[PDB]
């Protein structure tokens, strides 16, 4: 931003060919960090910080990933703490466990379509579906 | 993030447990591969775990 | 990559002890950005950009967390 302090290093001691090597903005700098911290910031928060005990904190407002092929997470465990709005097909290869009422048009169980299934009643006849 | 997080990827895998702590939503054919567990499965508006069929001799069957 | 322009700053004015402080590549640099930006790039797209109104855009091809 305008107002930053630059270090101009003239080449060949001419006051021309002046080249700015570093441009610091002391008004918008992160301060009071841990001994070994390396990151990238912006002039209002927005810190992608890598801290001591293997933590890649990403403090931002609206993160928007933009991939072209795929996105592999490769983590033994991941939580979300919020709503998820997957807009296409899902797939799970493990014992998924829900804790509230689930809703769907029909639940094809083992190939047998629920919402249209008919049992065989006591007196040898198809039981009305429900 | 303070507001929302958009992934915008045609395909994404996870390779591990997921512990979504709030409401889920899928607009496509969500195919599972193991037993699912829920208090009840509201199917097409008909609440499973309380449904009663109409038996052969003109009467309600059982709630199971 | 080869062909980048470096600023050699000789120490003690000897033409030895030459140290390269900055190595710019003007051929592969992001241009025409908003007033306040800060990111990291690669010589074909791949911008992890921080934009004005709290947007941490991550434009890549196949992002792989580990
Ligand atoms: Fe039934």
Swiss-Prot record, chain C:
Coiled-coil ranges per UniProt: none
Q: Where in the cell is it found?
A: Virion; Host cytoplasm
Q: What happens when the gene is disrupted?
A: No tail is synthesized.
Conditions for induction: Expressed in the late phase of the viral replicative cycle. Expression of late genes is activated by the viral late transcription activator C.
Top-level taxon in the UniProt lineage: Viruses
- Role description: Component of the baseplate that forms a central needlelike spike used to puncture the host cell membrane for tube insertion during virus entry. Probably involved in baseplate and tail assembly. Serves as the distal plug of tail tube channel and might regulate the process of the phage DNA and protein ejection into the host cell.
Domain observations: The C-terminus is a needlelike shaped homotrimer consisting of an intertwined beta-sheet, a triple beta-helix and a metal-binding region.
> Self-association or partners: how does it assemble?
Homotrimer. Part of a complex composed of three DNA circularization protein N, three baseplate hub protein gp44 and three sub-complex wedge (made of two copies of each baseplate protein gp46, gp47 and gp48) that forms the baseplate.
Per its record, how is this protein called by name?
Baseplate puncturing device gp45
């Amino acid at each position: 931003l305008p107002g930053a302090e630059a270090l101009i290093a003239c080449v060949g001691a001419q006051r021309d060919q002046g080249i700015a090597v570093v441009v610091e903005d002391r008004r918008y700098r992160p301060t009071n960090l841990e001994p070994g911290d390396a990151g990238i910031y912006h002039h209002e928060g927005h810190r992608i910080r890598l801290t001591k005990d293997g933590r890649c904190i990403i403090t931002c407002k609206t993160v928007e990933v933009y991939a072209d092929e795929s996105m592999t997470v490769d983590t033994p465990r991941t939580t979300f703490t919020g709503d998820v709005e997957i807009q296409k097909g899902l797939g799970v290869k493990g014992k998924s466990q829900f804790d509230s009422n689930i809703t769907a048009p029909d639940a094809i169980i083992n190939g047998k379509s629920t919402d249209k299934h008919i049992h065989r009643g006591d007196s040898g006849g198809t039981t009305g579906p429900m």
